[PDB]
């Protein structure tokens, strides 16, 4: 797999795909 | 954070994998 700049909802889209059933935390405050 | 890691710089799906529950 390759790198890529993931920004805004595309990041959360990526996360969803990557994680799926496991779910994920989106926390831009870090 | 992920914004910095993946938006400001670049990242892989493995790096993204670190944020799954
Ligand atoms: Cl955009
Ligand atoms: Zn977009």
Residue numbers in the entry:
A (entry chain B): 1 to 30
B (entry chain A): 1 to 21
From the article:
In this work, we report the first SSX experiments with viscous jets conducted at ALBA beamline BL13-XALOC. Small crystals (15–30 µm) of five soluble proteins (lysozyme, proteinase K, phycocyanin, insulin and α-spectrin-SH3 domain) were suspended in lipidic cubic phase (LCP) and delivered to the X-ray beam with a high-viscosity injector developed at Arizona State University. Complete data sets were collected from all proteins and their high-resolution structures determined. The high quality of the diffraction data collected from all five samples, and the lack of specific radiation damage in the structures obtained in this study, confirm that the current capabilities at the beamline enables atomic resolution determination of protein structures from microcrystals as small as 15 µm using viscous jets at room tem­per­ature.
